[PDB]
Amino acid sequence: EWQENKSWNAHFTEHKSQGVVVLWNENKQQGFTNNLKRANQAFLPASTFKIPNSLIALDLGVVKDEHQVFKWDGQTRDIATWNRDHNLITAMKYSVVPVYQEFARQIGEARMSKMLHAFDYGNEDISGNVDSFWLDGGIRISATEQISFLRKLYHNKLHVSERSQRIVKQAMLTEANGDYIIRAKTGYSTRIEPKIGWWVGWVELDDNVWFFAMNMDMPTSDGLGLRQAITKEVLKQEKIIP
Amino acid sequence: VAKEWQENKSWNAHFTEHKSQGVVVLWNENKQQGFTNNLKRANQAFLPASTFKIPNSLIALDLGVVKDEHQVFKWDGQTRDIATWNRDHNLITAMKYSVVPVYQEFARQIGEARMSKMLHAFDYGNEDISGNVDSFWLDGGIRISATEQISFLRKLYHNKLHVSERSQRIVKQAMLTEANGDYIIRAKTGYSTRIEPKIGWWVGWVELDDNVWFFAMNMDMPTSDGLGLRQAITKEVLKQEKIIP
Numbered sequence: 001e002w003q004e005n006k007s008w009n010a011h012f013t014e015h016k017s018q019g020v021v022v023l024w025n026e027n028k029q030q031g032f033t034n035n036l037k038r039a040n041q042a043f044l045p046a047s048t049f050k051i052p053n054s055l056i057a058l059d060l061g062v063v064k065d066e067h068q069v070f071k072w073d074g075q076t077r078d079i080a081t082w083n084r085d086h087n088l089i090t091a092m093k094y095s096v097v098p099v100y101q102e103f104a105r106q107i108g109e110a111r112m113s114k115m116l117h118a119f120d121y122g123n124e125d126i127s128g129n130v131d132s133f134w135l136d137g138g139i140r141i142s143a144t145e146q147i148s149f150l151r152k153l154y155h156n157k158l159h160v161s162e163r164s165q166r167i168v169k170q171a172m173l174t175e176a177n178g179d180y181i182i183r184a185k186t187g188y189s190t191r192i193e194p195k196i197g198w199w200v201g202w203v204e205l206d207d208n209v210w211f212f213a214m215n216m217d218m219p220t221s222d223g224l225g226l227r228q229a230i231t232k233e234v235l236k237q238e239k240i241i242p
Numbered sequence: 243v244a245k246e247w248q249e250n251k252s253w254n255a256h257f258t259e260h261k262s263q264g265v266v267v268l269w270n271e272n273k274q275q276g277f278t279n280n281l282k283r284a285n286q287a288f289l290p291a292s293t294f295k296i297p298n299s300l301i302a303l304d305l306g307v308v309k310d311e312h313q314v315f316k317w318d319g320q321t322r323d324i325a326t327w328n329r330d331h332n333l334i335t336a337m338k339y340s341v342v343p344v345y346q347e348f349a350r351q352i353g354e355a356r357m358s359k360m361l362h363a364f365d366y367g368n369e370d371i372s373g374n375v376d377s378f379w380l381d382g383g384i385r386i387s388a389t390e391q392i393s394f395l396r397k398l399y400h401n402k403l404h405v406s407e408r409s410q411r412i413v414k415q416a417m418l419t420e421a422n423g424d425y426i427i428r429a430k431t432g433y434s435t436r437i438e439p440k441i442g443w444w445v446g447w448v449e450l451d452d453n454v455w456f457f458a459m460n461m462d463m464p465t466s467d468g469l470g471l472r473q474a475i476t477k478e479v480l481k482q483e484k485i486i487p
């Protein structure tokens with residue numbers, strides 16, 4: 001079920017980086033990783049938590065649909081794209097923290113905890129602030145647990161409406177062309193060490209789905225582009241993407 | 243400039259330079275304003291050909307002929323000219339490779355009575371299903387203009403069509419052509435080859451962060467040499483208008 005393919009380390013080494021890329025071939029029901037230990041190492045999900053947060057908010061009616069406008073609070077933040085009104089699509093695209101913080105507060109501790117349990121999401125521990133537990137609280141999820149979670153989302157098997165799962169998968173749309181479709185979410189766990197970068201999601205091909213979850217050491221924001229770059233090098237090596 | 247429809251003849255450069263003739267029709271969803279290089283051709287009704295895969299997919303999902311976007315539609319075993327058709331398909335791939343046999347079967351299952359009722363409810367072009375139940379969109383009575391394609395597409399985009407919200411969401415997912423950090427294109431190509439004038443189609447929309455640009459283009463297609471011009475000329479217009487980089 002889980003093969004260790006150490007050749008992918010070359011992609012990390014060539015990029016002066018370290019981390020794990022985890023791939024899951026849906027058709028074959030087989031997994032591949034350059035590091036089995038790191039693949040099962042649970043980390044703070046950071047912005048990858050916007051996937052279960054969106055799902056819960058949609059199912060509870062906190063988010064009516066992907067067109068609902070979430071007004072900017074007027075607070076100027078470091079990331080320029082957050083300093084405007086957003087809908088679910090753009091909030092996911094620009095990883096708009098205050099929008100997701102508001103969703104989490106509206107969901108509340110009790111429903112957030114019990115609904116995440118329904119998703120079997122990582123350690124299912126929401127300890128810390130309702131609006132920041134995914135960044136500096138007790139929640140932890142491994143790259144293999146991200147895959148397990150994403151596979152349920154792909155198949156509409158999470159215990160939420162099909163509609164909510166379709167809206168999130170639409171909001172996860174990152175890239176598409178004649179060769180593949182990528183539905184994914186980036187993350188950057190900046191608050192608690194080890195500071196890590198995430199990229200979780202999948203690649204849809206005509207006749208298969210390749211699920212992926214990657215994390216890498218991110219001591220600074222300088223290497224953030226490597227989350228997609230390294231994953232893409234692995235996908236290209238495995239002939240998943242041309 | 244405050245007008246609902248504006249003609250922009252400068253776009254004709256994109257057709258002429260490519261030794262082509264046609265119409266591109268754009269609709270700025272936010273401003274509720276339309277733009278075209280040819281007002282007359284924008285309203286000229288043609289056979290929808292493969293663009294009919296959008297309403298056909300909608301009807302088939304709503305009626306449960308297509309359970310979901312994963313349902314496998316087996317290859318009948320007949321070898322056809324377009325290689326990609328000679329294999330099993332789901333709604334995503336059938337739309338992607340415009341697999342005619344799959345859609346002919348859908349239409350036959352839907353039947354003429356339900357097909358007619360659905361198109362009238364969709365206000366789809368002239369709503370005329372005359373001809374073969376499995377070919378009317380290629381050689382029958384159905385006619386739709388580029389502007390009527392946009393009207394139909396706007397309702398689909400907003401889940402305003404009479405069929406289920408679910409069928410509309412699945413069809414828009416199946417329409418996914420291209421996506422990146424700047425835009426998302428949800429569209430369907432067409433090539434009306436049976437009844438003159440032989441024409442190429444490209445209908446759909448461009449999703450931006452804060453706007454949607456609906457488009458419908460058709461162009462003369464005397465040879466398959468110009469097929470790539472359907473997307474290329476549209477993209478030249480979208481680039482000229484600063485819609486896409």
Ligand SMILES: *C(=O)N1C[C@H](NOS(=O)(=O)O)CC[C@H]1C(N)=O
Nearest residue numbers: 046047095097186187188189190
């Ligand atoms: C999410 O992890 N964060 C919000 C935002 N996301 O950008 S990212 O998806 O490319 O990682 C910035 C980083 C991080 C945060 N500072 O909370």
Ligand SMILES: *C(=O)N1C[C@H](NOS(=O)(=O)O)CC[C@H]1C(N)=O
Nearest residue numbers: 291292340342431432433434435
């Ligand atoms: C649809 O109009 N057709 C099926 C197929 N479509 O490819 S297209 O979307 O690029 O136009 C080939 C042409 C046409 C047909 N022969 O029926």
